[PDB]
Design an enzyme around this catalytic site. Sequence first.
Site, PDB file in Angstrom:
ATOM      1  N   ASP A 103       4.237  -3.055  -4.624  1.00 52.46           N
ATOM      2  CA  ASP A 103       3.416  -4.237  -4.406  1.00 52.46           C
ATOM      3  C   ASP A 103       2.790  -4.521  -5.772  1.00 52.46           C
ATOM      4  OD1 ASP A 103       1.568  -6.187  -3.840  1.00 52.46           O
ATOM      5  OD2 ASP A 103       0.707  -5.185  -2.084  1.00 52.46           O
ATOM      6  N   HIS A 119       1.205   0.329  -6.325  1.00 48.34           N
ATOM      7  CA  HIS A 119       0.452  -0.752  -5.707  1.00 48.34           C
ATOM      8  C   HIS A 119      -0.595  -1.176  -6.731  1.00 48.34           C
ATOM      9  CE1 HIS A 119      -2.169  -2.249  -2.068  1.00 48.34           C
ATOM     10  NE2 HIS A 119      -1.871  -3.211  -2.924  1.00 48.34           N
ATOM     11  N   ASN A 159       1.640  -7.451  -6.729  1.00 45.89           N
ATOM     12  CA  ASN A 159       0.646  -8.522  -6.657  1.00 45.89           C
ATOM     13  C   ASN A 159       0.906  -9.571  -7.733  1.00 45.89           C
ATOM     14  OD1 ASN A 159      -1.315  -8.364  -4.465  1.00 45.89           O
ATOM     15  ND2 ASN A 159      -1.778  -6.327  -5.259  1.00 45.89           N
ATOM     16  N   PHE A 197      -2.575 -17.530   1.115  1.00 43.60           N
ATOM     17  CA  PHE A 197      -1.648 -17.127   0.059  1.00 43.60           C
ATOM     18  C   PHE A 197      -0.313 -16.717   0.660  1.00 43.60           C
ATOM     19  CE2 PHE A 197       0.544 -14.095  -2.634  1.00 43.60           C
ATOM     20  CZ  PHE A 197       0.454 -14.666  -3.889  1.00 43.60           C
ATOM     21  N   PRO A 212      -6.095 -12.310  -8.652  1.00 45.04           N
ATOM     22  CA  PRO A 212      -5.309 -13.247  -9.470  1.00 45.04           C
ATOM     23  C   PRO A 212      -5.928 -13.552 -10.817  1.00 45.04           C
ATOM     24  CG  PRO A 212      -6.363 -14.392  -7.653  1.00 45.04           C
ATOM     25  CD  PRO A 212      -6.528 -12.920  -7.382  1.00 45.04           C
ATOM     26  N   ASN A 235       4.416 -11.689   0.998  1.00 41.14           N
ATOM     27  CA  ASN A 235       3.050 -11.659   1.515  1.00 41.14           C
ATOM     28  C   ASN A 235       2.805 -13.022   2.138  1.00 41.14           C
ATOM     29  OD1 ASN A 235      -0.259 -11.809   0.122  1.00 41.14           O
ATOM     30  ND2 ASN A 235       0.304 -10.627   1.936  1.00 41.14           N
TER      31      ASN A 235
HETATM   32  N1  LIG Z   1      -0.795 -13.880  -8.042  1.00 37.60           N
HETATM   33  C1  LIG Z   1      -1.571 -13.403  -6.907  1.00 37.60           C
HETATM   34  C2  LIG Z   1      -1.264 -12.131  -6.199  1.00 37.60           C
HETATM   35  C3  LIG Z   1      -2.095 -11.690  -5.049  1.00 37.60           C
HETATM   36  N2  LIG Z   1      -3.194 -12.502  -4.620  1.00 37.60           N
HETATM   37  C4  LIG Z   1      -4.100 -12.159  -3.493  1.00 37.60           C
HETATM   38  O1  LIG Z   1      -3.931 -10.800  -3.164  1.00 37.60           O
HETATM   39  C5  LIG Z   1      -3.533 -10.671  -1.772  1.00 37.60           C
HETATM   40  C6  LIG Z   1      -2.581  -9.514  -1.620  1.00 37.60           C
HETATM   41  O2  LIG Z   1      -3.263  -8.277  -1.502  1.00 37.60           O
HETATM   42  P1  LIG Z   1      -2.442  -6.923  -1.335  1.00 37.60           P
HETATM   43  O3  LIG Z   1      -1.078  -7.171  -1.950  1.00 37.60           O
HETATM   44  O4  LIG Z   1      -3.162  -5.831  -2.140  1.00 37.60           O
HETATM   45  O5  LIG Z   1      -2.498  -6.599   0.152  1.00 37.60           O
HETATM   46  C7  LIG Z   1      -2.958 -12.036  -1.420  1.00 37.60           C
HETATM   47  O6  LIG Z   1      -2.984 -12.300  -0.026  1.00 37.60           O
HETATM   48  C8  LIG Z   1      -3.822 -12.989  -2.233  1.00 37.60           C
HETATM   49  O7  LIG Z   1      -5.050 -13.229  -1.556  1.00 37.60           O
HETATM   50  C9  LIG Z   1      -3.483 -13.758  -5.331  1.00 37.60           C
HETATM   51  O8  LIG Z   1      -4.420 -14.442  -4.955  1.00 37.60           O
HETATM   52  N3  LIG Z   1      -2.648 -14.187  -6.471  1.00 37.60           N
END
Ligand SMILES: Nc1ccn([C@@H]2O[C@H](COP(=O)(O)O)[C@@H](O)[C@H]2O)c(=O)n1
Length: 335
Positions: free
Chosen positions: A215, A177, A217, A279, A182, A274
Site C-alpha cells: 500500500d 505500508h 498510498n 477518494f 497526500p 482504494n
Molecule cells: N495520493 C493520495 C493517497 C492516499 N490518500 C488518502 O489516504 C487514504 C488511504 O489510507 P490507507 O491506504 O492507509 O488505508 C485514502 O482513502 C485517502 O483519504 C490521499 O488523500 N491521496
Amino acid sequence: LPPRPWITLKERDSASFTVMCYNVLCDKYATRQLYGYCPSWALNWEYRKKGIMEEIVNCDADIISLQEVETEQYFTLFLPALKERGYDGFFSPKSRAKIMSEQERKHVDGCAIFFKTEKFTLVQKHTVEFNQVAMANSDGSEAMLNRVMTKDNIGVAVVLEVHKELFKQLLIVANAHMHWDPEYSDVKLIQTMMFVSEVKNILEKASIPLVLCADLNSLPDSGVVEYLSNGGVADNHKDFKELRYNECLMNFSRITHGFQLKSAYENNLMPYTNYTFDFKGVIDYIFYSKTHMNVLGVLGPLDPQWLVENNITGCPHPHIPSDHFSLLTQLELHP
Ligand SMILES: Nc1ccn([C@@H]2O[C@H](COP(=O)(O)O)[C@@H](O)[C@H]2O)c(=O)n1
C-alpha cells in the site's frame, strides 16, 4: 456480489505461483467518522473479519501480503486460520519502540506475509523501520528528521526457498505500508527508496527475484511509482518538495536502484484499489522482477456496473469488507 473475473494475460511456459496484496482495513480505523456511509453493524470487526477471511480464502494465493493486520488478530485470527490452509506467516507491527499499555499493543497494526509451506521454506525474515532508517540518514537535513523520521511506517520482507518441485532457488517477498497523507509525497517517496535500498542490503547478506507488495498510498503518476518502474528518480523530482537536491537521499542509491520492476497491474486494469466516498484511486501495487518473471494472469476488478446498479459510492459495505480491493496475480518465475 458477482465474483471477480480471473484474467488470463499470457500462457504458461519454470515455476508459477500466485501473490495476493490486500489492505484489510484494521478495526482501529474502521469508524463512523471515516466511513459514515457504512452501517456500524457492517463496520464491526466480528462481522467484517468474516468477509476479510472469505476474500483471503477465495483468492487462495501461494503468497499473501496483508497490511493493517492488528497484532492480536494476527495471532488469534489470521495465522491460526491460514495455518489450516497450509500457510506459515511472518508478521511485524508498527510502533515496537513506542511505549504503550498491554491493551494498546494488542491493537497496533502491521504487515504480514503468508506463504504455503508445501511450496516455500522461509530462510530469513526482516522488519524495515522507516523512522530508524530516516533518523540514521538525517544528517544535514532538517526535513529528514522533522517530516520523515516522525512517521512510524514499516515494511517486512522474507527470503523464501522456492521448492524444486515447482519447476536452491530463492525469492524475496517484501510488503510495506507507506504514510498516507497526500501533502507528504516526499515522505512516501523517501520511505519507498529506504525500503528498496534496505531490501537490496537484505540480498547482499544472503541476482535474486523480488516481489514487492505495498500500500504505497501513491497514485500511478507519482514519484514513487516512477522510481519503482524506471529503476530510479531524479533527486530534484517535484515530489521531494524541497529539499529536492539534498545529498542525504543518495545514501539510498539521480537516485537509482538495481531492481528492474514492473507492476503486475499495468493499464488501470483495476481502475482503483482504494474506494471511498472522498477518494478513489490505484494506490496498492504488486511489483516483480521483470527479468525473472512473467505475468500469466491477474484478478480483474469488481464489476463497476454492479457498484453503479447498487449506488455504492464507497467501501467498506455490508458485502465489501475493506476500503481496499485485493490484488491477485499469477507469476511465472524463470531460472
Ligand atoms: N495520493 C493520495 C493517497 C492516499 N490518500 C488518502 O489516504 C487514504 C488511504 O489510507 P490507507 O491506504 O492507509 O488505508 C485514502 O482513502 C485517502 O483519504 C490521499 O488523500 N491521496
